Design a binder for this molecule. Structure first.
Ligand SMILES: CCc1c(C(=O)NC)[nH]c(C)c1C(C)=O
Length: 165
């Protein structure tokens, strides 16, 4: 199971880890991808997860989009986890670098409540432009299921833990 995590609350745990490496090690039931509405996994966590699947995640995602159309900002879809997890929950947090409503971050985290346990990144953090301290606060105030947060950057991980209220 998950190891080396710091417990933040009853159900939220955090670790300084590469989510790709964490997924390959644990093979969780659900890994969360920091997806965009088109499921175009170009960079950040999405590019890293997709590259770990040898692009199988992108091939599956393009078929999903061709059939269903784009996701909503704040929405999600469950696809295969490929070599990383049983499933991948592609969650679309608002991209503040695209001027998207930061208020949609709570709706994005609500998707996690449909899964008993998840390995996840902080939504809308990194290349999505939101404040990761704000993302962690929305996560602990929204997610009720067991979420194991992987934070890639050690310096950000320390800032998140040291400032956690
Ligand atoms: C492609 C770079 C990458 C990897 C990786 O390739 N791990 C094996 N994991 C992560 C989380 C990244 C990021 C944040 O972009």
């Amino acid at each position: 199971s998950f190891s080396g995590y710091l417990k933040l609350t009853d159900n939220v745990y955090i670790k300084n880890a590469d989510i790709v490496e964490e997924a390959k090690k644990v093979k969780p039931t659900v890994v969360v991808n920091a997806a965009n509405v088109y499921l175009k996994h170009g960079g950040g966590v999405a590019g890293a997860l997709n590259k770990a699947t040898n692009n199988a995640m992108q091939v599956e995602s393009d078929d999903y989009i061709a059939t269903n159309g784009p996701l909503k900002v704040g929405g999600s879809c469950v696809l295969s986890g490929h070599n990383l997890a049983k499933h991948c929950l592609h969650v679309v947090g608002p991209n503040v670098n695209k001027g998207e409503d930061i208020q949609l971050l709570k709706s994005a985290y609500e998707n996690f409540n449909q899964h008993e346990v998840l390995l996840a990144p902080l939504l809308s953090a990194g290349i999505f432009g939101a404040d990761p301290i704000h993302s962690l606060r929305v996560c602990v105030d929204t997610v009720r299921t067991n979420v194991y947060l992987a934070v890639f950057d050690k310096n950000l991980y320390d800032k998140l833990v040291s400032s956690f209220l």
